């Protein structure tokens, strides 16, 4: 069975004190043995975050990295420096980077191949805009973004896909569980045609976009929804309730 | 007179072991009483670097930051998070960001205004390419880049300017101290016309080309060269010789 996966994207938020609060809560509150939790703080706090974790269910991820490990790339993060301080994952292709930071499908693909090759897992984000959805192109869009990665990446063992409707980000407007389920099923079937049935059956496809403590349990029986990429709620006590939503 | 300023841009290079050797070496080194040294490691190592610093003349800086302090900006660094960990500076407008990551002139200006308003110093990078130099565009380029910042910020008390002869990178040209002095003098004179004579006479203008332990001394008597923004030599023992180059 696909292990339930809950990622926490802090985005540009946090401090040493607030993150110490977040990690101590995870360390001391009841969470399942049967869960894979990955908290993704700002790069400034990756080292400190890893240093605080006291549950094996919880590891730390970066929110972005470059497609080279070293060199004259002032301002970038490196998967090697992520590993050096003990983190194990990176988010690649978040809509905020695709939209505001010029990261096209191929850049995301090249970064994904590179990260995986350096032994870092990838939380790969995909998702359609409200105009694209209204146009009926949700599947065409996520297939396109996935196709770019499929071009470069043959082995998805250490990839987790985060499907995030762009209009669902920061607006409080979550996809319905039925809709996310139908979409995840479609995505899984498309990936089966490329990666094969077994790989598609093992790949976690997460839902992201206004996921929170109240609505996480509404997704509990959606078979193709394997977890969440949590945004704002990952900074809050209810992140624990999301983690336990399939308890 | 203007205080000698030496910044060390690590770029995408470093590990916790490098950081320890580099900072402990600075801690016990004999350097001038009044030099101002800023080491700028990957964001991943900002926290750890500040924790190891004991030299009063040494502070820690980031290599880039966004133009807001918090929010839904996955993958970015924040000046408030830089401050939280005890760092004090940020490099903005490095040629590697202007080129590879499409950071436009106003983007740099908006970041500069924002960082200074948050109480973080700015190492403001400017510089023209080989193509621009060969077209006689050197001052048009730097004045454009500086004008964009001046549109947003006129109090440059907490700014140092780093001139990068991008035209000397890999091109088979070398920028000489004489070249540095001439361009710096022109830059200072332009900025006097915008900021006033007193501000311009206090502003540090750093040579941000290839400087090392061997050649840093050849800039020692150039009146308008007030220090360095050093690249690869930041990670090496000779970073100390650069700091001591005007003894
Ligand atoms: Na997210």
Numbering used by the authors:
A (entry chain A), B (entry chain B): 2 to 248
Article sentences:
In the family of triosephosphate isomerases (TIM) there is a strictly conserved cysteine, which is located near the end of the β-strand 5, forming part of the hydrophobic core of the (β/α)8 barrel-structure displayed by these enzymes. The sulfur atom of this invariant cysteine (Cys126, according to the sequence numbering of Saccharomyces cerevisiae TIM, ScTIM) is located at van der Waals distance from one of the oxygen atoms of the catalytic Glu165; yet, substitution of Cys126 by Ala or Ser only slightly affects the activity of ScTIM. Mutation of Cys126 has, on the other hand, sound effects on the stability of the native yeast TIM dimer. The structure of C126S ScTIM shows the canonical features conserved for this protein, with the common (β/α)8 TIM-barrel fold consisting of a barrel of eight β-strands surrounded by helices.
To find out what structural modifications occur in the molecule of yeast TIM when Ser replaces Cys126, we determined the crystal structure of the C126S mutant at 1.86 Å resolution. The structure showed the presence of the substrate analog 2-phosphoglycolate (PGA) in monomer A only. The electron density observed at the active site of monomer B did not account for an intact PGA; therefore, we interpreted this density as a sulfate ion and glycerol with occupancies of 1.0. It is important to mention that the catalytic loop or loop 6 presents a “closed” conformation in monomer A (with PGA), and the “open” conformation in monomer B, which contains glycerol and a sulfate ion, a situation that has been observed before for P. falciparum TIM in the presence of 2-phosphoglycerate (2PG). In our structure, PGA is bound to the catalytic site in monomer A with a tight hydrogen-bond network including NZ-Lys12, NE2-His95, OE2-Glu165, N-Gly171, N-Ser211, N-Gly232 and N-Gly233, which are structurally conserved among different structures. The main local changes around the mutation include the presence of several water molecules, not observed in the wild type enzyme (respectively). In monomer A two water molecules establish three hydrogen bonds with Ser126, whereas in monomer B three water molecules form four hydrogen bonds with this residue. In contrast, Cys126 in the wild-type protein interacts with a single water molecule. The key point seems to be that, due to its highly polar nature, the OH group of the Ser residue turns out from the interior of the β-barrel and, in its new environment, establishes hydrogen bonds with Glu165 and two water molecules. This new rotamer orientation apparently gives rise to penetration of additional water molecules that likely modify the polar/apolar nature of an interior region of the molecule. Furthermore, a long stretch of residues (Glu132-Val142), which becomes unstable, as indicated by MD simulations, may be the origin of the faster unfolding of the C126S mutant with respect to the wild-type Sc-TIM.
